[PDB]
Design an enzyme around this catalytic site. Structure first.
Site, PDB file in Angstrom:
ATOM      1  N   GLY A 125       0.791  -1.211   0.000  1.00 34.33           N
ATOM      2  CA  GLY A 125       0.000   0.000   0.000  1.00 34.33           C
ATOM      3  C   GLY A 125       0.825   1.263   0.000  1.00 34.33           C
ATOM      4  N   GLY A 129       8.699  -6.949   1.788  1.00 40.64           N
ATOM      5  CA  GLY A 129       8.595  -6.073   2.935  1.00 40.64           C
ATOM      6  C   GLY A 129       9.260  -6.652   4.166  1.00 40.64           C
ATOM      7  CG  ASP A 148       8.744  -6.323  -6.822  1.00 43.06           C
ATOM      8  OD1 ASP A 148       8.307  -7.314  -6.203  1.00 43.06           O
ATOM      9  OD2 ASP A 148       8.183  -5.208  -6.801  1.00 43.06           O
ATOM     10  N   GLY A 183       2.874   2.098  -3.277  1.00 46.95           N
ATOM     11  CA  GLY A 183       3.121   2.497  -4.649  1.00 46.95           C
ATOM     12  C   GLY A 183       4.385   1.910  -5.238  1.00 46.95           C
ATOM     13  CE  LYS A 184       7.852  -3.334  -3.073  1.00 45.51           C
ATOM     14  NZ  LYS A 184       7.395  -4.670  -2.627  1.00 45.51           N
ATOM     15  CB  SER A 185       2.929  -2.553  -8.565  1.00 45.67           C
ATOM     16  OG  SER A 185       3.511  -3.717  -8.002  1.00 45.67           O
ATOM     17  CE1 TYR A 186       2.254   6.629 -10.214  1.00 46.56           C
ATOM     18  CE2 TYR A 186       0.176   5.691 -10.902  1.00 46.56           C
ATOM     19  CZ  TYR A 186       1.050   6.749 -10.861  1.00 46.56           C
ATOM     20  OH  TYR A 186       0.722   7.934 -11.473  1.00 46.56           O
TER      21      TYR A 186
HETATM   22  N1  LIG Z   1       1.960   8.765  -7.737  1.00 45.75           N
HETATM   23  C1  LIG Z   1       0.712   8.257  -7.687  1.00 45.75           C
HETATM   24  N2  LIG Z   1      -0.343   8.913  -8.204  1.00 45.75           N
HETATM   25  C2  LIG Z   1      -1.589   8.408  -8.157  1.00 45.75           C
HETATM   26  N3  LIG Z   1      -1.876   7.219  -7.601  1.00 45.75           N
HETATM   27  C3  LIG Z   1      -0.909   6.456  -7.046  1.00 45.75           C
HETATM   28  C4  LIG Z   1       0.471   6.945  -7.063  1.00 45.75           C
HETATM   29  N4  LIG Z   1       1.220   6.014  -6.460  1.00 45.75           N
HETATM   30  C5  LIG Z   1       0.394   5.008  -6.088  1.00 45.75           C
HETATM   31  N5  LIG Z   1      -0.873   5.272  -6.444  1.00 45.75           N
HETATM   32  C6  LIG Z   1      -2.035   4.396  -6.180  1.00 45.75           C
HETATM   33  O1  LIG Z   1      -1.697   3.493  -5.130  1.00 45.75           O
HETATM   34  C7  LIG Z   1      -1.947   2.138  -5.501  1.00 45.75           C
HETATM   35  C8  LIG Z   1      -0.654   1.351  -5.322  1.00 45.75           C
HETATM   36  O2  LIG Z   1      -0.897  -0.036  -5.144  1.00 45.75           O
HETATM   37  P1  LIG Z   1       0.362  -1.013  -5.314  1.00 45.75           P
HETATM   38  O3  LIG Z   1       1.598  -0.168  -5.142  1.00 45.75           O
HETATM   39  O4  LIG Z   1       0.182  -1.813  -6.580  1.00 45.75           O
HETATM   40  O5  LIG Z   1       0.280  -1.989  -4.043  1.00 45.75           O
HETATM   41  P2  LIG Z   1       1.606  -2.768  -3.578  1.00 45.75           P
HETATM   42  O6  LIG Z   1       2.515  -1.665  -3.100  1.00 45.75           O
HETATM   43  O7  LIG Z   1       1.125  -3.701  -2.496  1.00 45.75           O
HETATM   44  O8  LIG Z   1       2.088  -3.460  -4.828  1.00 45.75           O
HETATM   45  C9  LIG Z   1      -2.471   2.137  -6.930  1.00 45.75           C
HETATM   46  O9  LIG Z   1      -3.819   1.666  -6.952  1.00 45.75           O
HETATM   47  C10 LIG Z   1      -2.398   3.575  -7.400  1.00 45.75           C
HETATM   48  O10 LIG Z   1      -3.650   4.013  -7.934  1.00 45.75           O
END
Ligand SMILES: Nc1ncnc2c1ncn2[C@@H]1O[C@H](COP(=O)(O)OP(=O)(O)O)[C@@H](O)[C@H]1O
Ligand SMILES: CC(=O)O[C@H]1C(=O)[C@@]2(C)[C@H]([C@H](OC(=O)c3ccccc3)[C@]3(O)C[C@H](OC(=O)[C@H](O)[C@@H](NC(=O)c4ccccc4)c4ccccc4)C(C)=C1C3(C)C)[C@]1(OC(C)=O)CO[C@@H]1C[C@@H]2O
Ligand SMILES: Nc1nc2c(ncn2[C@@H]2O[C@H](COP(=O)(O)OP(=O)(O)OP(=O)(O)O)[C@@H](O)[C@H]2O)c(=O)[nH]1
Ligand SMILES: Nc1nc2c(ncn2[C@@H]2O[C@H](COP(=O)(O)OP(=O)(O)O)[C@@H](O)[C@H]2O)c(=O)[nH]1
Ligand SMILES: [Mg+2]
Lengths: 441, 434, 345
Positions: free
Chosen positions: C95, C251, C248, C97-100
Site C-alpha cells: 500500500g 517487505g 522487486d 506504490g511499488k507497482s505504480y
Molecule cells: N503517484 C501516484 N499517483 C496516483 N496514484 C498512485 C500513485 N502512487 C500510487 N498510487 C495508487 O496506489 C496504488 C498502489 O498499489 P500497489 O503499489 O500496486 O500496491 P503494492 O505496493 O502492495 O504493490 C495504486 O492503486 C495507485 O492508484
C-alpha cells in the site's frame, strides 16, 4: 489487607528471590516448610503477614510469587532445595531452551508459549487478594529473558491490570565489567518497551556492590550470594511499612509520586549505607547522621555513577529501628548546608522521609551485622544520563556494522526496532539534560 | 531436556569419542555395563543430555558411528567402554574413502547416508527437545571430510533451527599425514562455512607442543591428544548438565561469539594443565588459569593470536569461584592487551560458571576464541591447493568419482573471501575525529 | 567507480483516505523529507540523493512517472551501451506504490515499460548494418534462500518448484543453473513472460493485505553488441555484454504486531536477513566509493551473491523506496526511510 505480587524473571531474579524470601521467612517467623511455629500465640493476630504470604487453613503460609526462567537450571534448585515445600509447585519452567541472551527469543519465540500460563497464575493470585497494590518485578538488563519476557509481561499487565504500580528492580549494566557481548542491545530494547509501562525502576550494579563488599565488609572474593542479600534488604526496607508499624509510613504509590516528576525519568538508584562487618559493628556509633551522610557518599552507591556530575531531583530516605525524627531533620539540615550535594531549582522540597520500628534481621551465613538502625536511600539523579550515554555509544559501534543482528532477525525481529529504540534513548538523554537547566522565563 | 546427538565419522572421530564417552561416563557415574555407580544426585538430573534410559536403569549413549571400515568398529567394541553403545547404531561399510573427499560424498557415502539418517531421526524424535548436534571429524582425509559434511548438509536441511557443532582436526603447517589434505580441507570448509554455527579447529602440532612444554610428556600417544579434546567438549556442555551461578549453552555462546555467520571457526583451549611433578608448586586460583588460557602456547589451532586480533572470546569456568575475580581478570585482559582485541566490540569476553567441577580438580576452565590468526590456517591451504590445482596433480582420482573442476574453484574462492573477512578486522585504524 | 542513488516517492492520498480523512505525517522542503508524529513531540529528518514528491499536482516539484524514469533509470540504460552492468532496487511496504513506480497501470507506465521501449527504440536507431544488438531475458525469485524459476509453466502437483542452486564461474562470476533464458524483440513479449511469472510468484493473504509479496523477484536483461572485425576476419569476434537487473523486493514484516507462526514467520526471517545483508552491501559500496577499502559481504545471501557483478566495480546501482504519508502507516514509513537512509553517503 494489602497485597503485593513479586515476579522474579530470569536467573538474576530467582537468585535474588531465594534471598528475599529467605529474609521474609525470618522477619515473620516462617520455617522453610511453610509452617510457622509461633502460630501458638495468635488467638487471631495478623502475623501471617498477608502482604507477601497467603495463609491456608492447615496452618501454612505460601508466598505470592511467580518464577520463570526459560531454563530449568535455577528453578529446579528451588524444587530440590530447602524451600521446596514452601512455594506452590507452579514454579513455571518452560526450559526446552533459553533466550540465548537474545531479546528476539524472550519476546516472541520462547517468550510466548509461556505468558498465558504466567498470566493465568497472576490472575489466580490477584483474585485471592482483596486490596492488591503493586507488582515488584525482578530482572536484569543484559539477558534475553529479563529483557524481552519482562517487556512482554509488562505490556500485558498494563492492559489486564491497568493503573496499578509496577516497580522494577533491575541489574543495570556496568561500564567496564560485563559477562556478555549483547547487553548494549538488550538494555536499549528493554528500556524502549518498559518505559511506557513501568512507573519506577530501581537500578543496581554488581561492580558497585563488589566495591562495597571489599571496602566495608572486607570481602576480597565475593559472589552473588553476598550481593543479593543486600538487594533483599533494599526490598525489605521498601516493603516494611506495609508489614510493620511505624511513625511515618510509606505506601508503594508514594515512590511512584515523590520520585517521578515526569513519566520518563523514573530511573532512580538505591543505597544502603550500614554494610559494615560485625568487627566494625564496634568502633562506630552508627547514628542517623553518619548513615545519612554515608548514603550521599559516591562510594556507597549501589550503582556506579558519581552524583557530583549531576543534580538530585528527589530522594526517598527509608529508615528502620530506633530513629527519632529530630535526628533526621538535623541530618537533612547538615546535607542541605553542604555545597557538593546540589539540587534542581524547581525542587526546593527535597527528601521523602519514612520511619519504621522493626529493625533488619540477620541471616546466618551473612556478612552484615546486627545494627540497631538501618537506612535505605533511593535517589533520582541526572548523572545516570552519563551511563545512558555509554550504553548508547557501544550500541553505535557494534550496530554500524550490523553485528549480532542476524541472530535477532532470525528469531522474529526487524532492522528498524534498533533505530526506534536508539532514537527513544536519545530523546531520553535530552529529557535528562532539560530538567538540569535552571529556570528562566 | 537439552539433548545432544553425537555423530562420530572416521578414525579421528571415533578415537576421540571413545575417550569422550569415558570422560562423560565418569562425570556421570556410568560403567561399561551402562549402570549408575556414582555418589551424588546431580549426575542423574540432566543425564538426558547425552544418554537415554533403558529397562534395568541402564544408560545407553546417543552416539552414531559412521566410519566406512570395520577396523574402528572392532576397536570401539573390543575396548573398555564398548558394551554400552547400541549395536544398531554402529553404522559402517567396507572399502573406505581412500583419502578421498569424492568417494565419501558422492560414491560410497551416498550408498550409506540413508542408514545414518534413519538412526539420526530415531534418536532425535525420541528427544523431548533437541539443542543441536555434535560431530568429531578430521578433514585432511576422506570419510570424516565427505561423509561428515554431507550429513551436516542433510541435517541442516532437516533441522534448520538447531545447532550443528563440529569439533574438527585440521591439518598442520609443517608435517602432513595425507598427501591430499589441501583439496579435502578446502572442500570441507566450503560445506562447513555454509552449514555450521560454531566450529572448533584443532591441530595435532599445537597439542604435541602442549604435551611437551606444559605436561612434560616425551612420548604422547593419541589417547593423550584426545584426552585434551574431550576436556574441551565437556567444558562446552557443562552448563546444560550441571548447575551454576551464571549459566550458558551452545546457542548463547554462538550468539555471543559470532558477529557474522561465516566467522564461526574458533580456537579451543583448557586449563589447568600441568606436569605431575609441578603440581605441588602451583596454586589453584583464577589468575593462574586466566594466565594459562590466554597463553599462545596453550592453544589447539596452531595459530598465534599475537599475529591477529581477538573478536570475541569465551570462558566456561567450573568450580566454586567468585564472580568478582572473573570480572576483574577478564577486564584486565581487555586493558593490558588492548591491541589484541577489537575496538568496536567493547567487551569481547563472555563468562560462564558451573558449581560442579571435574572429578580431580577444585577448579577448571575452558576457553573458546575467535581470532584473525586462523586466517593463517586457510591461507596456507589455498597456497598448497592452487599449486596442485595449477598442475592438476591428484585430481583424476576425484573427477572419476563424479566431480568437476568448478567445485574446486568455488571452495577456493570461498576460503579466500573468508580470509579477507578475517583480515578486514586486524588493522586498527581510527575515525574522523570521534 | 560505483556510488548508489537512493530515492523516495511519497504516494498521494487514496480517495478512500481523504474521504475517511486520514492525517498527513510526511512533509517535505524540496531537499529533505520530514516525519512529524501525530503527538507532535518528535520530528525526524531524512536526506536523500533524490526525493520525489507525488503528493499533489499543484505543488512545485511534482514527481510524475516521466521524471522518475529520466532521473533514475535512464542513466542506467545509458551505462548499458557503454558496456557496464546496472541494478535497480525497488523497496516498499504494501500500500505504498511499488507497482505504480515500476510496472504501472495501463496508462501512466512505470519504469519497466518506459525502460524497455526506450531501449528498443534506441537500438532501432543505433544499429548500422555493422553493429547488432541481441537481448536475452530471465525472471526468477528467492524463497527461503531457495532459487525458483517462474517462466516455466508448472503443472499442478505437490509443486514443481525445483530448488535450483547457484554456482561460481571463474570469469562469468556467480550464475544460476537451469535458468530458462528467453529472447526478446520488442516490449510486447516481456509483458507475457512477466504476467506468466507474477501469476506463479509466491503470495499469502497475511493480516496486512489480501496478497503480499512473500518472495523477491529478479528480472534480468542481457544485451550483446556485436560489431565487426574486418581487419581481415568476420565476427563472432567482439561481444561487449551488459546485465541490467530490475529487482522487486519484499517487505520487512515486523512480527511484533503480526502474530506470525510457521511458514509466514520463516518467510519473514528470510526476507529480513536478505534485506540486512543488502544494506550491508550498499553501505560497503558507498564507503568504497568514498575511498575506503572494505569487504562487501556478498556470500551471506543469494540475492547479493548472484547480483555481485551487477553491483560491483564498473556498475551503477539505483534504489527507490515508497512511502505512504498516512498516519496509520507511520511505523512502516519510518523503517523504510531508515532502511534507505543507510545508503546515501
Ligand atoms: N503517484 C501516484 N499517483 C496516483 N496514484 C498512485 C500513485 N502512487 C500510487 N498510487 C495508487 O496506489 C496504488 C498502489 O498499489 P500497489 O503499489 O500496486 O500496491 P503494492 O505496493 O502492495 O504493490 C495504486 O492503486 C495507485 O492508484
Ligand atoms: C591427583 C591428581 O590431581 O591427578 C591429576 C593430575 O595430576 C593432573 C596433572 C591431570 C592429569 O591429566 C594428565 O596428566 C593428562 C594426560 C593426557 C592428556 C591430558 C591430561 C590426570 O591424569 C587427569 C585427571 O583429570 C580428571 O580426572 C578429570 O576428570 C578429567 N577426566 C579424566 O581424566 C578421565 C580420564 C579417563 C577416564 C575418565 C576421566 C576431565 C577433565 C576435564 C573435563 C572432564 C574430565 C587428574 C585431575 C589428574 C590425573 C589423573 C593425574 C591434568 O588433567 C586435566 C585435564 O586437568 C593434567 O593436567 C591436569 C592437572 C592435574 O593436576
Ligand atoms: N546481582 C546479580 N546479578 C546476576 C545474577 N545472576 C546473573 N546476574 C546478571 O545477569 C546478567 C545476565 O542476565 P541473566 O540473568 O544471566 O539472563 P537470564 O535472565 O538468565 O536470561 P537467559 O539469557 O535466557 O538465561 C549478567 O550481567 C549478570 O551479571 C545474580 O545472581 N545476582
Ligand atoms: N587428533 C587425532 N587425529 C587423528 C587421529 N587419528 C587420525 N587423525 C587424523 O585424521 C586423519 C585420518 O583420516 P581418516 O578420516 O581416518 O581417513 P579414513 O580412514 O579414510 O576415513 C589424519 O590426517 C590424522 O591427522 C587421532 O586419534 N587423534
Ligand atoms: Mg538463564
Amino acid at each position: 489487607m494489602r497485597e503485593c505480587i513479586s515476579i522474579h524473571v530470569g536467573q538474576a531474579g530467582v537468585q535474588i528471590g531465594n534471598a528475599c524470601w529467605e529474609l521474609y521467612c525470618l522477619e515473620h517467623g516462617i520455617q522453610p516448610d511453610g509452617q510457622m511455629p509461633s502460630d501458638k500465640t495468635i488467638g487471631g493476630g495478623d502475623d501471617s503477614f498477608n502482604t507477601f504470604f497467603s495463609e491456608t487453613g492447615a496452618g501454612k503460609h505460601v508466598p505470592r510469587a511467580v518464577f520463570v526462567d526459560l531454563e530449568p537450571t535455577v528453578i529446579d534448585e528451588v524444587r530440590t532445595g530447602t524451600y521446596r515445600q514452601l512455594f506452590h509447585p507452579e514454579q513455571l519452567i518452560t526450559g526446552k531452551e533459553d533466550a540465548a541472551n537474545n531479546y528476539a527469543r524472550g519476546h516472541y519465540t520462547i517468550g510466548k508459549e509461556i505468558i498465558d500460563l504466567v498470566l493465568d497464575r497472576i490472575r489466580k493470585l490477584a483474585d485471592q487478594c482483596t486490596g492488591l497494590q503493586g507488582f515488584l518485578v525482578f530482572h536484569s538488563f543484559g539477558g534475553g529473558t529479563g529483557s524481552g519476557f519482562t517487556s512482554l509481561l509488562m505490556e500485558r499487565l498494563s492492559v489486564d491490570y491497568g493503573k496499578k504500580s509496577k516497580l522494577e528492580f533491575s541489574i543495570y549494566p556496568a561500564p567496564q565489567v560485563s559477562t556478555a557481548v549483547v547487553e548494549p542491545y538488550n538494555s536499549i530494547l528493554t528500556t524502549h518497551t518498559t518505559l511506557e509501562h513501568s512507573d519506577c525502576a530501581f537500578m543496581v550494579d554488581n561492580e558497585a556492590i563488589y566495591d562495597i563488599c571489599r571496602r566495608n565488609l572486607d570481602i576480597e572474593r565475593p559472589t552473588y550470594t553476598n550481593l543479593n542479600r543486600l538487594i533483599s534488604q533494599i526490598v525489605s526496607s521498601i516493603t516494611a511499612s506495609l508489614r510493620f508499624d511505624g511513625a511515618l509510613n510509606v505506601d508503594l504509590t508514594e515512590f511512584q509520586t515523590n520520585l517521578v516528576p515526569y513519566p520518563r525519568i523514573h530511573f532512580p538508584l538505591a543505597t544502603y549505607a550500614p554494610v559494615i562487618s560485625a568487627e566494625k559493628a564496634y568502633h562506630e556509633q552508627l547514628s542517623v547522621a553518619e548513615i545519612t551522610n554515608a548514603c550521599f557518599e559516591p562510594a556507597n552507591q549501589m550503582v556506579k555513577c558519581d552524583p557530583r556530575h549531576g543534580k538530585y531531583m528527589a530522594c526517598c530516605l527509608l529508615y528502620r529501628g530506633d530513629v527519632v525524627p529530630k535526628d533526621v531533620n538535623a541530618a537533612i539540615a547538615t546535607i542541605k548546608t553542604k555545597r557538593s550535594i546540589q539540587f534542581v531549582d524547581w525542587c526546593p522540597t527535597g527528601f521523602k522521609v519514612g520511619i519504621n520500628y522493626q529493625p533488619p534481621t540477620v541471616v546466618p551465613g551473612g556478612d552484615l551485622a546486627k545494627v540497631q538502625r538501618a537506612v535505605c536511600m533511593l535517589s533520582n539523579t541526572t548523572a545516570i544520563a552519563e551511563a545512558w550515554a555509554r550504553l548508547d555509544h557501544k550500541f553505535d559501534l557494534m550496530y554500524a556494522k550490523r553485528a549480532f543482528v542476524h541472530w535477532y532477525v532470525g528469531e522474529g525481529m526487524e532492522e528498524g526496532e534498533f533505530s526506534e529504540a536508539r532514537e527513544d534513548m536519545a530523546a531520553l538523554e535530552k529529557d535528562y539534560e532539560e530538567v538540569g537547566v535552571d529556570s528562566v522565563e | 531436556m537439552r539433548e545432544i546427538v553425537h555423530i562420530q565419522a572416521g578414525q579421528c572421530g571415533n578415537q576421540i569419542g571413545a575417550k569422550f564417552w569415558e570422560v562423560i561416563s565418569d562425570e556421570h557415574g556410568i560403567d561399561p555395563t551402562g549402570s549408575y555407580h556414582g555418589d551424588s544426585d546431580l549426575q542423574l538430573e540432566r543425564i538426558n543430555v547425552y544418554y537415554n534410559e533403558a529397562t534395568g536403569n541402564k544408560y545407553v549413549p546417543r552416539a552414531i558411528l559412521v566410519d566406512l571400515e570395520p577396523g574402528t568398529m572392532d576397536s570401539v567394541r573390543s575396548g573398555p567402554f564398548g558394551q554400552i553403545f547400541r549395536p544398531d547404531n554402529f553404522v559402517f561399510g567396507q572399502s573406505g574413502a581412500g583419502n578421498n573427499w569424492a568417494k565419501g560424498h558422492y560414491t560410497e557415502g551416498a550408498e550409506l547416508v540413508d542408514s545414518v539418517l534413519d538412526v539420526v531421526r530415531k534418536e532425535s524424535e525420541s528427544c523431548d527437545c533437541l539443542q543441536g548436534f555434535q560431530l568429531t571429524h578430521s578433514l585432511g582425509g576422506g570419510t570424516g571430510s565427505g561423509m561428515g559434511t554431507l550429513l551436516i548438509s542433510k541435517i541442516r536441511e532437516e533441522y534448520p533451527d538447531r545447532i550443528m557443532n563440529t569439533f574438527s582436526v585440521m591439518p598442520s603447517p609443517k608435517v602432513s599425514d595425507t598427501v591430499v589434505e589441501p583439496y579435502n580441507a578446502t572442500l570441507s570448509v566450503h560445506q562447513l562455512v555454509e552449514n555450521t554455527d560454531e566450529t572448533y579447529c584443532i591441530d595435532n602440532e599445537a597439542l604435541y607442543d602442549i604435551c611437551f612444554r606444559t605436561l612434560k610428556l616425551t612420548t604422547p600417544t593419541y589417547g593423550d591428544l584426545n584426552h585434551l579434546v574431550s576436556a574441551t567438549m565437556s567444558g562446552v556442555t557443562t552448563c546444560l548438565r550441571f548447575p551454576g551461578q551464571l549459566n550458558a549453552d551452545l546457542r548463547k555462546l554462538a550468539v555471543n561469539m559470532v558477529p557474522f555467520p561465516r566467522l564461526h571457526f574458533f580456537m579451543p583451549g583448557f586449563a589447568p594443565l600441568t606436569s605431575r611433578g609441578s603440581q605441588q608448586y602451583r596454586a589453584l586460583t583464577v589468575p593462574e588459569l586466566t594466565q594459562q588460557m590466554f597463553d599462545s602456547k596453550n592453544m589447539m589451532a596452531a595459530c598465534d593470536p599475537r599475529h591477529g586480533r581477538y573478536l570475541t572470546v569465551a570462558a566456561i569456568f567450573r568450580g566454586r569461584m567468585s564472580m568478582k575475580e572473573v570480572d576483574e581478570q577478564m577486564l584486565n585482559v581487555q586493558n593490558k592487551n588492548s591491541s589484541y582485541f577489537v575496538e568496536w566490540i567493547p567487551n569481547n569476553v563472555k563468562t560462564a560458571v558451573c558449581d560442579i567441577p571435574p572429578r580431580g580438580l577444585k577448579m577448571s576452565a575452558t576457553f573458546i576464541g575467535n581470532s584473525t590468526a586462523i586466517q593463517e590456517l586457510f591461507k596456507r591451504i589455498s597456497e598448497q591447493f592452487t599449486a596442485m590445482f595449477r598442475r592438476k596433480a591428484f585430481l583424476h582420482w576425484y573427477t572419476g568419482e563424479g566431480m568437476d573442476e568448478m567445485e574446486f574453484t568455488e571452495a577456493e574462492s570461498n576460503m579466500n573471501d573468508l580470509v579477507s573477512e578475517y583480515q578486514q578486522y586486524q588493522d586498527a585504524t581510527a575515525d574522523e575525529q570521534g | 567507480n560505483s556510488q548508489v542513488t537512493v530515492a523516495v516517492r511519497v504516494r498521494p492520498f487514496s480517495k478512500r483516505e481523504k474521504t475517511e480523512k486520514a492525517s498527513q505525517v510526511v512533509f517535505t522542503n524540496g531537499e529533505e523529507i520530514t516525519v512529524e508524529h501525530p503527538d507532535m513531540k518528535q520530528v525526524y529528518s531524512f536526506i536523500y540523493d533524490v526525493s520525489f514528491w507525488s503528493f499533489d499536482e499543484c505543488h512545485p516539484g511534482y514527481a510524475s512517472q516521466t521524471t522518475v524514469y529520466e532521473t533514475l533509470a535512464a542513466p542506467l540504460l545509458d551505462r548499458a551501451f557503454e558496456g557496464y552492468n546496472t541494478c535497480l532496487f525497488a523497496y516498499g511496504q504494501t500500500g505504498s506504490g511499488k507497482s505504480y513506480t515500476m510496472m504501472g497501470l495501463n496508462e501512466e507506465p512505470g519504469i519497466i515499460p518506459r525502460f524497455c521501449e526506450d531501449l528498443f527504440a534506441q537500438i532501432a536507431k543505433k544499429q548500422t548494418s555493422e553493429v547488432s544488438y541481441h537481448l536475452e531475458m530471465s525472471f526468477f525469485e528467492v524463497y527461503n534462500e531457495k532459487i525458483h524459476d517462474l517462466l516455466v509453466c508448472k503443472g499442478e502437483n505437490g509443486q514443481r518448484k525445483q530448488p535450483l542452486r547457484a554456482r561460481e564461474h571463474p570469469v562469468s562470476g556467480p550464475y544460476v543453473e537451469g535458468l530458462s533464458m528467453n529472447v526478446v524483440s520488442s516490449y510486447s513479449d516481456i509483458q507475457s513472460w512477466l504476467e506468466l511469472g507474477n501469476k506463479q510468484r509466491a503470495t499469502a493473504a497475511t493480516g496486512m493485505n489480501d496478497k503480499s509479496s512473500r518472495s523477491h523477484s529478479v528480472f534480468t536483461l542481457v544485451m550483446t553488441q556485436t560489431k565487426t572485425e574486418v581487419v581481415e576476419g568476420e565476427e563472432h569476434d567482439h561481444r561487449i555484454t551488459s546485465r541490467i537487473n530490475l529487482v522487486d523486493l519484499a517487505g520487512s514484516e515486523r512480527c511484533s504486531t503480526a502474530h506470525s507462526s510457521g511458514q509466514r514467520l520463516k518467510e519473514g526471517v528470510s526476507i529480513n536477513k536478505s534485506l540486512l545483508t543488502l544494506g550491508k552491501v550498499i553501505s560497503a559500496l558507498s564507503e568504497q566509493a568514498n575511498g575506503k577499502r572494505v569487504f562487501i559481504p556478498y556470500r551471506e545471501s543469494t540475492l547479493t551473491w548472484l547480483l555481485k557483478e551487477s553491483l560491483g566495480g564498473n556498475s551503477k546501482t539505483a534504489m527507490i523506496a515508497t512511502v505512504s504519508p498516512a498516519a496509520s502507516n507511520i511505523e512502516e514509513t519510518l523503517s523504510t526511510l531508515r532502511y534507505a537512509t543507510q545508503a546515501r553517503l
